[PDB]
RNA sequence: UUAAUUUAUUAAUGCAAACAGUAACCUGCAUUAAAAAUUUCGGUUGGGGCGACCUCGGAGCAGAACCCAACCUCCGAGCAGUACAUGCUAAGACUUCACCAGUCAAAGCGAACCUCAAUUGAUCCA
């Protein structure tokens, strides 16, 4: 994904009006890319003990690739949704 | 041969004036009038500002 | 090749008998085609100007240079023993008197 | 505050100065002397 | 100078003039002398002084400027403490 | 200080108007005796043959301003007399 | 509906909070003092209102 | 100007002189577009008031 | 094209992004190439070309208030030196035939007790 700042300034047109645009408003200047960004980490609840990377029942911050192409498809983990979190807590308590 | 230089007053700070001096010789110190202070005061050379 | 310089527009700006106010330039020159006389000044160009309100007059007056100015002195020394140099001088002859006493009040 | 600070600085400078000027004068004199000496040689 | 604009069909102002000059209500045009913030070292003090003054434009120049602007820049403006306010109106003329 | 029933103010338009403020100096009880004496000594030029300290002022087009100026003058004089 | 008017923006606030220019947010204890001062300056007597 | 208005009947000094009243009288025409911020009282008829 | 500005196309690379593991194919940003693409080709001139010149100043033509040309005749300049009140301001003038640029300058307030012929360059931008 590319974020593209618009050079040349759209001249500001009303509440309920489209602002017509010019072939110089078509000129852009890319401010940032979503790529070339600090890689973030995703939260997952583990349904199974995995190696040293996760303890069963616990909520861990994983590398996103690992989450998306291994853990989630293989039923080894689930998203940090508030829904199932409660359930997991309950399970822990029971244990 | 000659350098342009800025000269900064010690008393009556903020007032700077531009003068000539030969490139080969000493950093310049000079008595000169500050219209802020309204008295003559020593200026000291600081930063050359083009050479010629 | 060479230079083609514009005309300099120098010369007399005010002639004898003209009414010339303080500040009016009287004559502009390079070198002294005229010299400053009574109530007439000299700018850095050698340009002559009126120092008071009045009338311009021209006169041929005996010229004595300043002692400190060397070249003139030398010239003077060179001249024979009954010679006097002479030069043209521009004067303003002032018209309106500087002062008039007026009655302010009876105290 | 701004007015005070700059003003204070200025005052300080003024206080300093009288002797600074003297020093400068002395330096100038010294320089002159040196020049004279050089000329003599 | 766009005697008729595209959308409104009104005359436009050449904004250069507006940037550079001050129209007094009497219709004098005041300008900063050119070459006044430049090469001030080589210039003699008198020259500097001359260059730091404002100046009134020639009649022809004034006329040109009037043509170049719209009637908005010629209106009476009652500013609180504009330093030029006293020069807008003219006193004691005679031909 | 300066109660205005003591003073004699007279106007004169001529744009610059003129406001003649005037009063008998020696008999003015509102001015102190030594102060009065001092005033007499100093501003004798302003005082009339009759014995009235006249100090007119002209500067503004409105007479009020002139009057104010005149008033201020008296105050200034008093101050001077004091020290 | 008839709206509520807004206050001085920023640099008009010191104007209208002083009683020497009869400001509508200025403290009315000082108004009389101001009046007195004015009277002292420009002659004439304050008519008691 | 104010004095004149008073004399002429328009602008009643028995009521308060608000901007609105003045406008009604048609002493002071003002225009919010072109950024007028109301009337300013001026010294021009200082005496003879 | 070995004139300028560009590389959006193709070119490989390089770094990201995607990837896998263990003790390639695609997108984004950089790179230098190839290929192209916009583009313009100043004036004076005894036709044009070639050669020379193109701004400023002094002298002659232009003999006596200014002004006055030529690819007419002759000199030069594109700086120095001294200061560091080459501080502030200000009546009144001159002006290179417009404008822009230049010049002179009484008084006043501050202080003491400029030389030089030419010696330079607007606006916007930095
Ligand atoms: Mg609308
Ligand atoms: Mg040609
Ligand atoms: Mg030929
Ligand atoms: Mg001319
Ligand atoms: Mg003087």
From Swiss-Prot, chain A:
Localization annotation: Mitochondrion
Similarity-based family: Belongs to the bacterial ribosomal protein bL9 family.
Subunit structure: Component of the mitochondrial large ribosomal subunit (mt-LSU). Mature mammalian 55S mitochondrial ribosomes consist of a small (28S) and a large (39S) subunit. The 28S small subunit contains a 12S ribosomal RNA (12S mt-rRNA) and 30 different proteins. The 39S large subunit contains a 16S rRNA (16S mt-rRNA), a copy of mitochondrial valine transfer RNA (mt-tRNA(Val)), which plays an integral structural role, and 52 different proteins.
Descriptive protein name: Large ribosomal subunit protein bL9m
Organism: Homo sapiens
From Swiss-Prot, chain C:
The keyword Ribosomal protein belongs to this UniProt entry's keyword annotation: yes
Subcellular location: Mitochondrion
UniProt superkingdom: Eukaryota
GO biological process, one term: mitochondrial translation
Gene Ontology cellular component annotations, sorted alphabetically: mitochondrial inner membrane; mitochondrial large ribosomal subunit; mitochondrion
GO molecular function: RNA binding; structural constituent of ribosome
Keyword terms of this UniProt record: Mitochondrion, Ribonucleoprotein, Ribosomal protein, Transit peptide
Family from the record: Belongs to the bacterial ribosomal protein bL27 family.
Subunit note: Component of the mitochondrial large ribosomal subunit (mt-LSU). Mature mammalian 55S mitochondrial ribosomes consist of a small (28S) and a large (39S) subunit. The 28S small subunit contains a 12S ribosomal RNA (12S mt-rRNA) and 30 different proteins. The 39S large subunit contains a 16S rRNA (16S mt-rRNA), a copy of mitochondrial valine transfer RNA (mt-tRNA(Val)), which plays an integral structural role, and 52 different proteins.
Name under which the protein is recorded: Large ribosomal subunit protein bL27m
Annotated organism of origin: Homo sapiens
Taxonomic lineage from the root: Eukaryota, Metazoa, Chordata, Craniata, Vertebrata
Gene this protein is translated from: MRPL27
Curated annotation (Swiss-Prot), chain F:
Tissues expressing the protein: Down-regulated during the in vitro differentiation of HT29-D4 colon carcinoma cells.
PTM annotation, UniProt: Methylation of glutamine in the GGQ triplet by HEMK1.
Signal peptide bounds: none
Subcellular location: Mitochondrion
Protein task: Essential peptidyl-tRNA hydrolase component of the mitochondrial large ribosomal subunit. Acts as a codon-independent translation release factor that has lost all stop codon specificity and directs the termination of translation in mitochondrion, possibly in case of abortive elongation. Involved in the hydrolysis of peptidyl-tRNAs that have been prematurely terminated and thus in the recycling of stalled mitochondrial ribosomes.
Sequence similarity: Belongs to the prokaryotic/mitochondrial release factor family. Mitochondrion-specific ribosomal protein mL62 subfamily.
Subunit structure: Component of the mitochondrial large ribosomal subunit (mt-LSU). Mature mammalian 55S mitochondrial ribosomes consist of a small (28S) and a large (39S) subunit. The 28S small subunit contains a 12S ribosomal RNA (12S mt-rRNA) and 30 different proteins. The 39S large subunit contains a 16S rRNA (16S mt-rRNA), a copy of mitochondrial valine transfer RNA (mt-tRNA(Val)), which plays an integral structural role, and 52 different proteins.
Protein name: Large ribosomal subunit protein mL62
Provenance organism: Homo sapiens
Gene: MRPL58
Residues shown, of full length: 71 to 163 of 206
Swiss-Prot record, chain H:
Subcellular location: Mitochondrion
Coiled-coil ranges per UniProt: none
Family: Belongs to the universal ribosomal protein uL15 family.
Name of the protein described by the UniProt record: Large ribosomal subunit protein uL15m
Included stretch of the parent chain: 100 to 148 of 296
Subunit-level organization: Component of the mitochondrial large ribosomal subunit (mt-LSU). Mature mammalian 55S mitochondrial ribosomes consist of a small (28S) and a large (39S) subunit. The 28S small subunit contains a 12S ribosomal RNA (12S mt-rRNA) and 30 different proteins. The 39S large subunit contains a 16S rRNA (16S mt-rRNA), a copy of mitochondrial valine transfer RNA (mt-tRNA(Val)), which plays an integral structural role, and 52 different proteins.
């Amino acid at each position: 994904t590319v974020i593209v700042e618009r050079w040349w300034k759209v001249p500001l047109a009303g509440e309920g009006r489209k602002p017509r645009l010019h072939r110089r408003h078509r000129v852009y200047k890319l401010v940032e890319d979503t790529k070339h960004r600090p890689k973030e980490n995703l939260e997952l609840i583990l349904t199974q003990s995995v190696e040293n990377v996760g303890v069963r029942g616990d909520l861990v911050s994983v590398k996103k690739s690992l989450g998306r192409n291994r853990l989630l498809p293989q039923g080894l983990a689930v998203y940090a949704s508030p829904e199932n979190k409660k359930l997991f807590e309950e399970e822990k308590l029971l244990r | 041969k000659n350098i342009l230089v800025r000269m900064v007053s010690e008393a009556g700070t903020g007032f700077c004036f531009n003068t000539k001096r030969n490139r080969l010789r000493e950093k310049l110190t000079l008595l000169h009038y500050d219209p802020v202070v309204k008295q003559r005061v020593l200026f000291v050379e600081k930063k050359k500002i083009r050479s010629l | 090749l060479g230079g083609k310089s514009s005309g300099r527009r120098q010369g007399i700006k005010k002639m004898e008998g003209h009414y010339v106010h303080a500040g009016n330039i009287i004559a502009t020159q390079r070198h002294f085609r005229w010299h400053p006389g009574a109530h007439v000044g000299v700018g850095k160009n050698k340009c002559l100007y009126a120092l008071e309100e009045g009338i311009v007059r021209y006169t041929k007056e005996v010229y004595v240079p300043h002692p400190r100015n060397t070249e003139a002195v030398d010239l003077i020394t060179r001249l024979p023993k009954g010679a006097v140099l002479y030069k043209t001088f521009v004067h303003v002859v002032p018209a309106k008197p500087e002062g008039t006493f007026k009655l302010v009040a009876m105290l | 505050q701004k007015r005070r600070e700059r003003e204070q600085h200025i005052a300080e400078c003024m206080a300093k100065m009288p002797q600074m000027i003297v020093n400068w004068q002395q330096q100038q004199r010294e320089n002159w002397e040196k020049a004279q000496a050089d000329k003599e040689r | 100078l766009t005697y008729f604009s595209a959308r409104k069909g009104k005359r436009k102002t050449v904004k250069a003039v507006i940037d550079r000059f001050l129209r007094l209500h009497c219709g004098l045009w005041v300008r900063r002398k050119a070459g006044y913030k430049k090469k001030l070292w080589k210039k003699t003090p008198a020259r500097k002084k001359r260059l730091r003054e404002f100046v009134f434009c020639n009649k022809t120049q004034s006329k040109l400027l009037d043509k170049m602007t719209t009637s908005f820049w010629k209106r009476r403006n009652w500013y609180v403490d504009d330093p030029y306010q006293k020069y807008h109106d003219r006193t004691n003329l005679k031909v | 200080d300066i109660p205005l029933d003591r003073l004699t103010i007279s106007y004169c338009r001529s744009v610059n108007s003129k406001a003649e403020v005037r009063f008998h100096l020696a008999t003015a009880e509102w001015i102190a005796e030594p102060v009065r004496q001092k005033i007499a000594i100093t501003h004798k030029n302003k005082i009339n043959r009759l014995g009235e300290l006249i100090l007119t002022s002209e500067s503004s087009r409105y007479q009020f301003r002139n009057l104010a100026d005149c008033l201020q003058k008296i105050r200034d004089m008093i101050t001077e007399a004091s020290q | 509906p008839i709206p509520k008017r807004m206050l001085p923006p920023e640099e008009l606030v010191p104007y209208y909070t002083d009683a020497k220019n009869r400001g509508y947010l200025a403290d009315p204890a000082k108004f009389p003092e101001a009046r007195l001062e004015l009277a002292r300056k420009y002659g004439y007597i304050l008519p008691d209102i | 100007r104010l004095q004149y208005l008073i004399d002429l009947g328009r602008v009643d000094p028995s009521q308060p002189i608000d901007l609105t009243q003045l406008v009604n009288g048609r002493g002071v025409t003002i225009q919010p577009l072109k950024r007028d911020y109301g009337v300013q009282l001026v010294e021009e008829g200082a005496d003879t008031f």
